C-alpha cells in the first residue's frame, strides 16, 4: 500500500530548508532554539 | 494455549531424559585396521566386502 | 618546566631495583617524566621475525625521573642540584653537596 512518506527533494527543501526557515520570524525562532540546544543538523539542508 | 506456570528445573530435566545423540554403527575392517560404518564402503582403502569398489589414484 | 636532568648527564638511581647504579642518560620523555639510562632497567622483548629474524631483545626501559639524581663531580655521589647565574650571567646547574658546576 501507499505509505505516508513519498520523497521529493524539491518539496523537502521548499518546506523545511534553510531559506524557508530564514524567511519567517518563527522559523528564525526554530533556528535559534536548535543552535542553543547545539544540534549538529540545523535544518534538512545540512543532510546528505 | 498458555503455560499457567513456568516449569521447574526438575520437570524440564525429566522431559529431557530421552534426548540423546545416537551412536554410529561402526565396524572395524581388520585388514585396514581402522573404523568405518557397517554396510558402507570403507572410505580410506575404497574396499567393500574385500573387493575394491572405489579406486582412488 | 625545566627538568633537573638532561641528555648526556650522569645520573644515579636512588630508588627501585637498580638502586645504587649510575649511568648515562640517553633520552628524556618529558610528557611521561621518564628517562632512559644506559645499561639499566633492561627488559626482554619478544620481537616477531617481521623486522625491517625476531628473537628476544634486551633493551633499556625508561625510569621515572624522580628516581634519578645527578652524580656529584667531586665525590661521585647522588645529590640534589640547584641553579645560579655564576656563569657570566647565564643560569647553570650546580651540586648542593659540594658547589661545583654540573657539566
Amino acid at each position: 500500500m501507499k505509505r505516508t512518506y513519498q520523497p521529493s527533494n524539491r518539496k523537502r527543501l521548499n518546506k523545511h530548508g534553510f531559506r524557508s526557515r530564514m524567511a519567517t520570524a518563527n522559523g528564525r525562532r526554530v533556528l535559534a532554539a536548535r543552535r542553543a540546544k547545539g544540534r549538529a543538523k540545523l535544518t534538512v539542508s545540512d543532510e546528505f | 494455549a498458555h503455560p499457567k506456570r513456568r516449569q521447574s528445573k526438575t520437570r524440564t530435566a525429566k522431559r529431557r531424559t530421552h534426548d540423546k545423540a545416537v551412536m554410529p554403527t561402526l565396524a572395524k575392517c581388520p585388514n585396514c585396521g581402522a573404523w568405518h560404518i557397517y554396510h558402507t564402503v570403507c572410505g580410506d582403502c575404497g574396499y567393500y566386502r574385500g573387493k575394491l569398489a572405489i579406486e582412488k589414484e | 618546566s625545566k627538568l633537573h636532568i638532561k641528555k648526556g648527564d650522569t645520573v644515579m638511581v636512588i630508588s627501585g631495583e637498580d638502586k645504587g647504579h649510575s649511568g648515562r642518560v640517553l633520552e628524556v620523555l618529558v610528557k611521561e617524566q621518564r628517562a632512559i639510562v644506559e645499561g639499566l632497567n633492561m627488559i626482554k622483548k619478544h620481537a616477531k621475525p617481521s623486522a625491517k629474524q625476531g628473537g628476544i631483545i634486551s633493551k633499556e626501559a625508561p625510569i621515572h625521573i624522580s628516581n634519578l639524581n645527578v652524580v656529584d663531580p667531586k665525590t661521585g655521589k647522588a645529590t640534589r642540584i640547584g641553579r645560579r647565574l655564576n656563569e657570566n650571567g647565564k643560569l647553570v646547574r650546580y651540586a648542593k653537596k659540594s658547589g661545583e658546576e654540573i657539566k
Binding site: - | 534426548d19 540423546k20 545423540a21 551412536m23 554410529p24 561402526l26 581402522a34 573404523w35 568405518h36 560404518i37 | -
Partner: protein
C-alpha cells in the same frame, strides 16, 4: 609474596593434568552437551571413531579438541600414547557469551534472537 606462592602451587599442580579447552564456540551449548554425554568415559580411539562418524555437527569440533588433548598428554608425559591406553576421563560443556539479534514479527513487533556459544573442556588419562 602471597600471590607468587599461590601461583607457584597452582603451576606445580597443573603439571599432572592433561587437558584441552575450546573457548567461545559459536553454537548451542545444549546440542554440544549431547555429544559430550555420548563420549564421556570412553576410550580415546573409539571416541575418535565415534566423533568422526557421528551425525551431529558439533562432533567435528569435539574431535579436534580431543586430538589436541591427546597431544597435550603426549607432550607432558614425553612419550607417545599406546593403543587403548588413554580414555576420556572428564568432559564438560559450559555456556558462553550470547549475541543478541532482532527479528521482525507481524504487526510491527520485534522479537529477540539469541545466538549462543559454549566452552568445552576435555581431560584425558590412563585406564589405571
Amino acid at each position: 609474596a602471597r600471590k607468587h606462592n599461590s601461583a607457584e602451587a597452582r603451576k606445580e599442580a597443573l603439571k599432572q593434568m592433561y587437558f584441552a579447552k575450546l573457548r567461545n564456540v559459536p553454537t548451542s551449548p545444549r546440542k554440544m552437551r549431547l555429544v559430550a554425554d555420548m563420549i564421556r568415559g570412553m576410550e580415546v580411539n573409539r571416541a575418535l571413531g565415534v566423533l568422526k562418524f557421528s551425525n551431529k555437527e558439533a562432533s567435528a569440533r569435539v574431535e579436534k579438541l580431543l586430538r589436541s588433548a591427546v597431544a597435550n598428554w603426549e607432550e607432558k608425559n614425553e612419550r607417545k600414547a599406546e593403543e587403548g591406553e588413554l580414555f576420556v576421563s572428564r568432559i564438560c560443556v559450559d555456556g558462553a557469551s550470547t549475541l543478541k539479534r532482532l527479528r521482525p514479527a507481524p504487526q510491527g513487533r520485534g522479537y529477540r534472537i539469541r545466538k549462543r556459544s559454549n566452552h568445552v573442556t576435555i581431560y584425558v588419562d590412563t585406564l589405571n
